[PDB]
A paper describes a structure:
One new defense system is the short prokaryotic Argonaute TIR-APAZ (SPARTA), which is activated by foreign (plasmid) DNA to unleash its TIR domain for NAD(P)+ hydrolysis. The resulting depletion of the essential metabolite NAD(P)+ lends to the killing of the infected cell (abortive infection) as a means to prevent the spread of the invading DNA to the remaining bacterial cell population. The SPARTA system was first discovered in 20186 and further characterized by Koopal et al3 in 2022, who showed in an elegant set of studies that the short p-Ago of SPARTA associates with a TIR-APAZ protein to form a catalytically inactive heterodimer with 1:1 stoichiometry. However, upon guide (g) RNA and target (t) ssDNA binding, four heterodimers transition to an oligomer (a tetramer of heterodimers) that unleashes the NAD(P)ase activity of the TIR domain for abortive infection.
The cryo-EM structure of SPARTA in the presence of the gRNA/tDNA reveals four SPARTA heterodimers (A, B, C and D) assembled into a tetramer of heterodimers. The oligomer resembles a butterfly, with the MID, PIWI and APAZ domains on the outside (“wings’) and the TIR domains on the inside (the “body”). Each SPARTA heterodimer binds a single gRNA/tDNA duplex via their MID, PIWI and APAZ domains. The gRNA/tDNA duplex as a whole is accommodated in a channel that runs between the MID-PIWI and the APAZ domains. In addition, a Mg2+ ion is observed in the MID binding pocket that is coordinated to the 5’ phosphate, A3 phosphate, and Asn468 (and putatively to the main chain carbonyl of Ile507). Another major conformational change is the C-terminal terminal helix (αN) of APAZ-L2, which is ousted from its Apo position to allow binding of the 3’-end of the target DNA strand. Loop8-9 both lengthens and extends (towards α10) and residues Asp306 and Asp309 move >10 Å from their position in the Apo structure to demask the positively charged pocket for dimerization. Thus, whereas the TIR domains of heterodimers A and C are in the same orientation as in the Apo heterodimer, the TIR domains of heterodimers B and D rotate from their positions in the Apo heterodimer by ~175o in the active oligomer. Interactions between TIRA and TIRB as well as TIRC and TIRD are by mediated by a BE interface, involving residues from the BB loop of TIRB or TIRD and residues from βD, βE and αE of TIRA or TIRC. Further, TIRA-TIRB are related to TIRC-TIRD by screw-like symmetry resulting in a TIR assembly akin to the “parallel-strands” arrangement observed in scaffolding proteins (Myd88 and MAL, for example) as opposed to the “antiparallel-strands” arrangement of TIRs in enzymatic proteins (SARM1 and RPP1, for example)21.
Numbering used by the authors:
A (entry chain E): 1 to 149, 205 to 507
B (entry chain I): 103 to 149
C (entry chain D): 301 to 350
D (entry chain D): 3 to 38, 46 to 150
E (entry chain F): 51 to 100
F (entry chain H): 1 to 100
The structure:
Amino acid sequence: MKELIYIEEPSILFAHGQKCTDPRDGLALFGPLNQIYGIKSGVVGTQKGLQIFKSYLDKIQKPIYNHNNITRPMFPGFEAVFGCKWESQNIVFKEITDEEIRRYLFNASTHKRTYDLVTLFNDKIITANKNDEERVDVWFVIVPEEIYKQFHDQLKARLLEHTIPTQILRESTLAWRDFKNTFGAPIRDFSKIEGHLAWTISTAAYYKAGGKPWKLGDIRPGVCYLGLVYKKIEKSKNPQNACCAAQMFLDNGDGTVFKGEVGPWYNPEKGEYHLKPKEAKALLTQALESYKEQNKSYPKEVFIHARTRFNDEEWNAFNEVTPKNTNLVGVTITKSKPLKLYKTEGAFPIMRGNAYIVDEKKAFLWTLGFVPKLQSTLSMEVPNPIFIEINKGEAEIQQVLKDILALTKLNYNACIYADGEPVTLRFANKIGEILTASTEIKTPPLAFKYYI
Amino acid sequence: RYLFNASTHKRTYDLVTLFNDKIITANKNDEERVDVWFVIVPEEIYK
Amino acid sequence: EKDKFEKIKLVGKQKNKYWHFGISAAGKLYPSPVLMVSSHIIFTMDGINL
Amino acid sequence: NKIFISHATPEDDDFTRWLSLKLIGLGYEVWCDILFWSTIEKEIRENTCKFLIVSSTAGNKREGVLKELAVATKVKKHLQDDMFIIPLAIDENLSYDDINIEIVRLNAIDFKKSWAKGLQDLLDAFEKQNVPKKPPDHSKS
Amino acid sequence: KEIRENTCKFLIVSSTAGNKREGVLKELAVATKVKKHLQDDMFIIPLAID
Amino acid sequence: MRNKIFISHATPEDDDFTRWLSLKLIGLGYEVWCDILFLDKGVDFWSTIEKEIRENTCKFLIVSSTAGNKREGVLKELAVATKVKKHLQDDMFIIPLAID
Ligand SMILES: [Mg+2]
């Protein structure tokens, strides 16, 4: 028999300096940390899209209940939770006629239809942004049903060109009862989860409008956190491999910084998911200067993690550019290595947080599983564990595992208990997906509002 | 450093570059929203 | 017999189809010599014809 | 120095947890059946300061809330205070003309539109009527 | 129950003891509420005895 | 204690004007009793209104519009105001305000 150690779940810091574990439960009792006075919305869609959006925005002003309020907590309402005013009356509207949509989607092509639709929506948004007096914080693109049947990434990149926050909302999400189809049953019924949809939409809107929902408190001061993800831009001419990063360091005191580190550094080879010495030096220097500009001092340790191994050709450059006594640690997080642990007695899966330590440099973290607080499973069937390996450098495995849970506890795009992998990798992948569809953007913004 | 010496055009370009670099970098590399930016020009910069 | 080996059923019926339980395997030698088995479900139509 | 909240047991529960924890956060000692029969009757008489009753279709006919309301009315007729009972309207399918007696003559607060406005006006009323308090201790909630 | 389901014509006595008593006031409030639902102007017929 | 200046209005609309008037009058140093600002919660609805109209109102201002002049509560307060005016023998006690 082999023993599995347990890692206590991390705690996130909400308003008033109080700690909790579930964001859905900590936002209701205490609330967000910062004060934004209100969200002035903007809609770019058909007039029926405007009606749907206003109906939904009026519906979410009052409490909404789920079927199970232990697994899925209820929603008090936007103003009760966040202390803001996101009303359905201070709404700026830019209409798209059905004639334009039909003209641009009738036959055309595929790469021509998508380009034309993106041009139409972006022309409306950018024109409203540059020549108008009314201030709009978040732009809500209500996409009809015939448009979503590639567009999202193009829209986000071509708006990234001008740094405008945006949120795409299909009409099936907000009016799921009307789009019956089939033989009388909705294609996606939300009847039992209507308190989770409101939670997720509200938290996304709050974050994209300059708000700070929660923050991490249990992480080592001084150390950085970089996550490298490689994407194949090889779909176009001159096949290459682009790399993207994301940094999560802590402020000089009582703060959390979570941005991107982009400028994607390419690789001319085909299967070489690695980096050249000069590009590695540039990446490390940029990250270190980003940390030093905020904390007015150099880091104490750099914690680089990725889904792939690190060769000796890049680590030498990394050590060449690192100054003073800034240590470096390389970690590799594989996801689908075939090890499944069952339970001898019971129909419920293994608890989340169990770690099986193979060697001093390897471990088996369990991120998905059974959460006692929700009394339900975070996944389906038997959960799969992630594999953590200290590739390059010297560090303790337990500290690495604690840091992995801490990173897992930082998803702003959705309001859930936790994820199944560190959020830095996921956000870097999102950034890479956005930047691949673009056309040679120079010095992109480092804020997740424009990407997420 | 920037104000002293240099040409009358060069020093103005340097000060404008400094202020606008700060403003733009804060605009694109930050999360906090700023509706309007206020530039509090010191006394020596004016002359 | 009765589609059950040791009171555990390994083949049944899904509407007009039949479902079978299947496994794979793969060697591994670092921690200890093991045989990692992965589970699958294989569907047929008559019960003998894939 | 207490605050008493009466509600239906199976329904109108989530509102009560939310309100109770919010009021405890700001420093208002509240006595609700969720947090914890003769004890209730002693707290309505010798301990409570403001008696709040939740109005809903599920309520408005339950026996326990009616008995607590009757005891609260008897205490109000002796304490010489006209603001001892403050109904809270937390429904939208019950008219303002179908409210039971003994409370039908009192102006409600209308938590129906939004809960934050109701909480703000409740705190304003407490500050206006000089309900005792302690400095906010958000740890306890 | 009687004021809302069985009555046909409310009558209230008016005196210096009445018009200030709590029970009379509550019955009056319920009667006024029933008055609008029934759409009958002559529902409350006061009786002045003092 | 006849110093208050009672103001009556309609329930759903004709409220912004009443709020503006009450705020301006209180800023000017008068004393104004209104249903919007005053009338603390948990109080009997009509007994306090009657007591204020009888024993506390120096003047009685009623707003007149298509919204009002047909609502039951406005007419009730008007009847009580007329009774108090007849008792007080003050000719200028009800001052209509035609906002519409
Ligand atoms: Mg999103």
